[PDB]
């Protein structure tokens, strides 16, 4: 009976810890996903801005 009781209490404790990790992980990963979404958008206008002046300078 003592082994059964200690097994039950340790099972409850580890389930609590697992849920404590689980609740954090989802939003922790979602925030970084949202941040990377912004990262993907950066390099758009730079290409045109850099190429137009080079083309005009080559024309001259």
């Amino acid at each position: 009976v003592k082994q059964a009781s200690i097994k039950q209490i340790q099972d409850a404790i580890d389930l609590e810890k697992s849920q404590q990790a689980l609740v954090q992980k989802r939003h922790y990963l979602f925030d970084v996903q949202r941040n990377n979404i912004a990262m993907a958008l950066e390099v758009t206008y730079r290409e045109r801005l850099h190429r137009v002046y080079k083309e005009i300078k080559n024309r001259l």
């Binding site: 689980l22 958008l41 290409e47 045109r48 137009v52 083309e55 024309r59």
Partner: protein
Amino acid sequence: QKLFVDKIREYRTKRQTSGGPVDAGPEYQQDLDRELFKLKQMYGKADMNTFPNFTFEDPKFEAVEKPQS
């Protein structure tokens, strides 16, 4: 210096040539055309009076289905 003065006179006469860089050179036109063609080929196609205008687009990463808790 008199020989140098004669040289100066010849230089001045070449300066006052109405035809300029003609020099009675039959091959001057051919040489100039060949040089111009070589320069154009080296620099590639271009326009003497034009401006560079262009536009482009960039597609971001497409969404990928992924189900999770």
